[PDB]
Amino acid sequence: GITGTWYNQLGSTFIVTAGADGALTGTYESRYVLTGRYDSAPATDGSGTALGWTVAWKNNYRNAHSATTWSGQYVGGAEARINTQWLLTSGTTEANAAKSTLVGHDTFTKVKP
Amino acid sequence: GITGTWYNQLGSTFIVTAGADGALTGTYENAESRYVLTGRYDSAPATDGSGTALGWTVAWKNNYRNAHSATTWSGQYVGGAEARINTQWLLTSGTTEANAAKSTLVGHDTFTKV
Amino acid sequence: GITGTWYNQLGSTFIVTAGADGALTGTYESSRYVLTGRYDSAPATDGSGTALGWTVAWKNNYRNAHSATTWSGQYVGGAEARINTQWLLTSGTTEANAAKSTLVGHDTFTKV
Amino acid sequence: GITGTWYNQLGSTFIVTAGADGALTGTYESAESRYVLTGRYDSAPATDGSGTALGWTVAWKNNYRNAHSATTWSGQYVGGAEARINTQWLLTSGTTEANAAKSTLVGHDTFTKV
Incomplete structure (x- = not known):
């Protein structure tokens, strides 16, 4: 159900x-x-399925010195979807700690929009 | 500096x-x-002197218990004598669609080595 | 622009x-x-939006949830005018449960 | 007990x-x-024994400066020996729609009368 290729509202792809x-x-x-x-x-x-995951934004090509965590639930059925809220934390100095974390929401679907 | 045992103020322990x-x-x-x-x-x-970005997830099921929920912590490791991990967290509980709006708690935690 | 009646998708109405x-x-x-x-x-x-925020404490002359929601977001004008928000709902708790006091969510309002 | 002068951990003062x-x-x-x-x-x-639920907004425009953003704080007042207001806040900036995803900061603030 959750296993598969998922797309967010901005055309990002989540293969899990x-x-x-x-x-x-x-x-x-x-x-x-x-x-x-x-x-x-x-x-x-009929309750959804609780889940979460993390991406640290470092690969072989770049490092943004940040990590995003998604927290949400999978709701199966006709239009299967995963409803999440996310927190994106950047590595900062202490003076800057206050503004290190962004918050947002993502909806994932198995059909690419 | 991250590997080891970390403690929050409410007693919780995490070994990474x-x-x-x-x-x-x-x-x-x-x-x-x-x-x-x-x-x-x-x-x-x-x-x-920036901190180290990280995150982790715990789903609250083990072989003895299932709370039908998952917490994700987003934060950074700041080394030094009072080495710390400062996080914000999201706790999502499985809900019916009817109540999903109330499905997610937000908070913050600070972990120390002692 | 902002002044007027606004609707979210779960049947709530705000006049501002x-x-x-x-x-x-x-x-x-509500x-x-x-x-x-x-x-x-x-x-x-x-083209940037207009930052805004507002607070509702959930007490009136008929009821009280001992809670308050704050909405933070931006108004976006145009053909498809919208107010996009994220919110925080905090309830009064003892400090034993204060770590589960606040829910977070998001809301989109349209002029419908 | 909410009325009066409060301070956060970072130096800002809030008069309610x-x-x-x-x-x-x-x-x-600030x-x-x-x-x-x-x-x-x-x-x-x-x-x-429960605290008092509250929220407030600041838009970051005054007669001298305009950040084109707004912060809301949501939390509760806990009267006591050490009376305090514990909050979480959201800071949204006016952005174009392409940047709309990175428009909101989340954090937390504790206020005391000292």
Whole structure:
């Protein structure tokens, strides 16, 4: 269900595998390594499936000295989607610590818009 | 400086290993209160005295418990004598669509080596 | 521009008057609660949006959730005028539960 | 106890008046650094030991400067020996739509009367 190729509202691509253990492994598209966890035994009451992951924005080509974490839930069904909020923290100095973290929201869908 | 055991002020413990690939792996803590964590950190941070960006996720299920929720911490490691990890976190609970708007708590945590 | 009636997608209604002095005052029909806030009364005219924020404390003469929501965002004019926000909802808790006191979310308002 | 002069950890000062029907009015000083604030609070809180829920907004325009941004603080007042206001805040900047995704900062502030 979660396993697959996902797209956010800005055309970013999220390729993930949901492991049996609760593990999330994949790539965020340059391309970056992602890792996280998900609820591998969600409720049956129609509630969504809790999950999150992290990308540290360093690959072989660039380093932005930052990391984004996504926290959200997968809702399966006809138009499967993953609704997240995210926090993007940059490495800063102490004087600048106050403005190190951005907050936003992303919706992922299995159809590219 | 990241590898090891870190403590928050509410007693919570987190043991991490920071691999050279930028991977973070460990547990967040009695067995029934132990959970798996995984994340990423910047393995080649600036040297201007900036901190080291990182993040990690814990889903609150283990073999004994399932809270149908996941927390992600976004923050930075600041080394020195009072080495610290300053984070902001998001806690999302699985909800019906009806109540999703109230699905996500936000907060902050500071972790120390003691 | 900002002054007028605004709707989100989950059936809530906010009526707001944007004052010359940078004040935002009005009503949020969730029943009805007083709102108050501030906006940039001299934005850039380069296409950027107008920063603004407002607060609703969830008490009126009929009820009280012992909570307050604050909305932070920007107005965007044009054919498809919108106010895009992120919000924080904080409830009164004991300090034992103060770490789970605040929810975060997002809301888009249109002139509908 | 909300009414009076408060300080955050970083040096800024916030002067509030708590009104009888839930209004917050006052000034935030980070004269050229002085800004109007406005907000609301729970004027009839819980008598169970819970704090008092509140929020306020500052738009970063005064007679001398304009940042084209606004901060909202959401939190609660905890009266006591060390009476305090614990908040989380969102700072949004006016951006073009292409930059709209990086328009909002999140952080937290604690205020005391000392």
